[PDB]
Amino acid sequence: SVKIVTSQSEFDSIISQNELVIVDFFAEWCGPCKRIAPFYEECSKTYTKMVFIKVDVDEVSEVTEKENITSMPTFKVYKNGSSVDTLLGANDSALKQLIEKYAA
């Protein structure tokens, strides 16, 4: 169950309250963006050791500035409340290997 956080601090909070956190910075008008969620959901079930959340750029622009979100869709894994890995474009297979690396 991917988590949807609409607050700026809530987003940052998730990042710091866990050892490993994977969050997909994505935006509401693309087919892939929504399309990557279904696979993301599967990944959240086996990878339940890693915390999965979703944060849009429109509702929380401040979030974009926090990680300087430049290329979307962007999938970044956070370790110890910080950056660790970056994935360009939302692919089920690309994330499979990315999420698998820390989450397996």
Domains within the chain, CATH numbers bracketed: 1-104 (3.40.30.10)
DSSP character at residue 72: S
Cβ contact 75:86 at 8 Å: yes
Length of the chain: 104
Q: Residue written as tokens 């401040």?
A: 62
DSSP character at residue 56: E
43 is catalytic: no
Cβ contact 76:85 at 8 Å: yes
Helix H or strand E encompassing 76:
strand 74-79
Experimental method: NMR
Tokens of 22: 């994977």
Catalytic residue, chosen from 9, 17, 30, 41, is 30
Q: Torsion over CA of 68, 42, 16 and 9, rounded to 10 degrees? A: 60
Catalytic residue, chosen from 33, 37, 69, 94, is 33
**Closest by Cα among 70, 54, 63 to 21:** 54
